Curated annotation (Swiss-Prot):
Isoform 1 is involved as a ribosomal RNA processing factor in ribosome biogenesis. Binds to tightly bent AT-rich stretches of double-stranded DNA. Disulfide bonds: none annotated. This is Peptidyl-prolyl cis-trans isomerase NIMA-interacting 4. One of its GO terms (cellular component) is preribosome. It catalyses: [protein]-peptidylproline (omega=180) = [protein]-peptidylproline (omega=0). GO terms for molecular function: bent DNA binding; DNA binding; double-stranded DNA binding; peptidyl-prolyl cis-trans isomerase activity; RNA binding. Residues 6-99 form the PpiC domain. Isoform 2 is much more stable than isoform 1 (at protein level). Ubiquitous. Isoform 1 and isoform 2 are expressed in kidney, liver, blood vessel, brain, mammary gland, skeletal muscle, small intestine and submandibularis. Isoform 1 transcripts are much more abundant than isoform 2 in each tissue analyzed. Isoform 1 is found in pre-ribosomal ribonucleoprotein (pre-rRNP) complexes. It is an enzyme of class 5 (isomerase).
Amino acid sequence: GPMGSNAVKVRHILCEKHGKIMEAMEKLKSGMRFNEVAAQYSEDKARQGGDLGWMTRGSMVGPFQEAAFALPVSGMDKPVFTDPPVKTKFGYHIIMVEGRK
Ligand code: NA
Ligand code: NA
């Protein structure tokens, strides 16, 4: 149905360990740009600055999807990200959304 046409352009920092995702969160809260935090800490898409690109509804793991569609579009100078980090079967994610359909 129509909700399957919904999508987000999404960027994340993924860390297996809670301690490490919290380190990443401290860097974001210090002002570090999201892509730079992802380069330092993310275990997925690190070389893309955490960018997952466009992801349609149904393509993301449940807790990640619910968190992502709840975030407004933001940019890396004025980010709006998940706090606290979101736990999935992959680990802990910090997410921001750069586009919405
Ligand atoms: Na842990
Ligand atoms: Na999960």
